[PDB]
Swiss-Prot record:
UniProt domain C2: residue ranges: 19-138
Section covered of the full-length record: 141 to 266 of 422
Binding positions (Ca(2+) 2): L49, D50, D108, D110, D116
Principal location: membrane
Complex formation: Homotetramer. Heterodimer; heterodimerizes with SYT2 in presence of calcium. Interacts with SCAMP5. Interacts with STON2. Forms a complex with SV2B, syntaxin 1 and SNAP25. Interacts with SV2A, SV2B and SV2C. Interacts with RIMS1. Interacts with PRRT2. Interacts with DNAJC5 in a phosphorylation-dependent manner. Interacts (via N-terminus) with RAB3A. Interacts with SYT12. Interacts with calmodulin. Interacts with DNM1 (via C-terminal proline-rich domain (PRD)); this interaction facilitates vesicle fission during clathrin-mediated endocytosis (CME).
Domain of life: Eukaryota
Protein name: Synaptotagmin-1
GO biological process, one term: protein heterooligomerization
Length: 143
């Protein structure tokens, strides 16, 4: 925006991953039935509301670039450490899965306003190890 002579910072700190919580999920391709199984297990350390209070988290799960309706977990009210314990199934033949990307996005449910996103992350199908169940914690990223 300018020569950048004045500024200080701060800039390195602003680049770091924000503490927006983490989501544990699992993933397995069922070659018998030809479907992708996704386990939305639990989230931890979701951020407290600006001025105290807990959020009402739920997770949207879907595949890009597919235009189909997103799956959603139940809403867990007033908790920053929800255990979802839900499984979703995507009926997609393996051959068609390679170019897709799984997205998991945690939102804060509200009945009277747009639901604020808490954070999200993506899992490209082309870097998943289909020979073993995948299970990991992922830090939620801004957006
Ligand atoms: Cu093995
Ligand atoms: Cu093993």
């Amino acid at each position: 925006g300018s020569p950048g002579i004045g500024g200080g910072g701060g800039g390195i700190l602003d680049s770091m991953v924000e503490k927006l919580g983490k989501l544990q999920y699992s993933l397995d391709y069922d070659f018998q039935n030809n479907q992708l199984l996704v386990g939305i297990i639990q989230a931890a350390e979701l951020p407290a509301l600006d001025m105290g209070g807990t959020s009402d988290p739920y997770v949207k799960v879907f595949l890009l670039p597919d235009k189909k309706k997103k799956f959603e977990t139940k809403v867990h009210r007033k908790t920053l450490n929800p255990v979802f314990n839900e499984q979703f199934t995507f009926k997609v033949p393996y051959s068609e899965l390679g170019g897709k990307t799984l997205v998991m996005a945690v939102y804060d449910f509200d009945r009277f306003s747009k639901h604020d996103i808490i954070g999200e992350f993506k899992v490209p199908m082309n870097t998943v190890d289909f020979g073993h169940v995948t299970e990991e914690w992922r830090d939620l990223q801004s957006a």
